Design a protein around this ligand. Structure first.
Ligand SMILES: *C/C=C(C)/C=C/C=C(C)/C=C/C1=C(C)CCCC1(C)C
Length: 227
């Protein structure tokens, strides 16, 4: 085959792999129970992403969806990746500020709708409806972001400054990155088809890598993970 975006897939594969191993190695040398918790979660995130990037690199997770009079290439392997990586990231943040069980369930469920409608939208054949699904998926995301910003930040105030200040950073990196995904989708292959697939793939690998390995390095080097 040799599609124009493969080099971005090979690069996402690579970065996700090194990040997985470094976290794995750093996580099995720590004795603290809580630290082990955050470590097991944060290493699983880039591990799921590495397998998904590898599959796509090798020709899987791709389907030709018909709409707009064209045969559009939609990488569905992404949603298979984000379906488990996104709620796991949310969990790290909820465990950090001592989010309540009810809070966590609702964030994971919201996350579920977001990825579900997102994929359903990316597979829809009626061009206009693709945007009806995209619309719902984004509304779910804003719910998640509102909670992280208005709820979590508030509960992180009963924590120590070291924990509150680490969460702020992760909360900020998450808000900036997640907000970018609905936009790439809209002007890319699953949407308006303005940005070509090769560029779109590069945009996604930068967000995925920053939101997983970036987020991970920040959380795992902090002392807020210790019980
Ligand atoms: C490691 C991956 C991360 C942090 C992925 C975050 C992904 C999102 C915030 C995705 C959002 C989407 C929408 C708001 C609507 C359209 C489809 C999605 C799934 C691309």
């Amino acid at each position: 085959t040799g599609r124009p975006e493969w080099i971005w897939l090979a690069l996402g594969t690579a970065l996700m792999g090194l990040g997985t191993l470094y976290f794995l190695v750093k996580g099995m040398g720590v004795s603290d129970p809580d630290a082990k918790k955050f470590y097991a979660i944060t290493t699983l995130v880039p591990a799921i992403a590495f397998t998904a990037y590898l599959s796509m690199l090798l020709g899987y997770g791709l389907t030709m969806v018909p709409f707009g009079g064209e045969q559009n290439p939609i990488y569905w392997a992404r949603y298979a990746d984000w379906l488990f990586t996104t709620p796991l990231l949310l969990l790290d943040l909820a465990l950090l500020v001592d989010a309540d069980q009810g809070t966590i369930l609702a964030l994971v469920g919201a996350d579920g709708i977001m990825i579900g409608t997102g994929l359903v939208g990316a597979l829809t054949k009626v061009y206009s409806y693709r945007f009806v699904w995209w619309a719902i998926s984004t509304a779910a995301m804003l719910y998640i972001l509102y909670v992280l910003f208005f709820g979590f930040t508030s509960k992180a105030e009963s924590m120590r400054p070291e924990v509150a200040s680490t969460f702020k950073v992760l909360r900020n990196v998450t808000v900036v990155l997640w907000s970018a995904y609905p936009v790439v989708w809209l002007i890319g292959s699953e949407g308006a088809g303005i940005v070509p697939l090769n560029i779109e793939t590069l945009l996604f690998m930068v967000l995925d890598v920053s939101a997983k390995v970036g987020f991970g390095l920040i959380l795992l080097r902090s002392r807020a993970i210790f019980g």
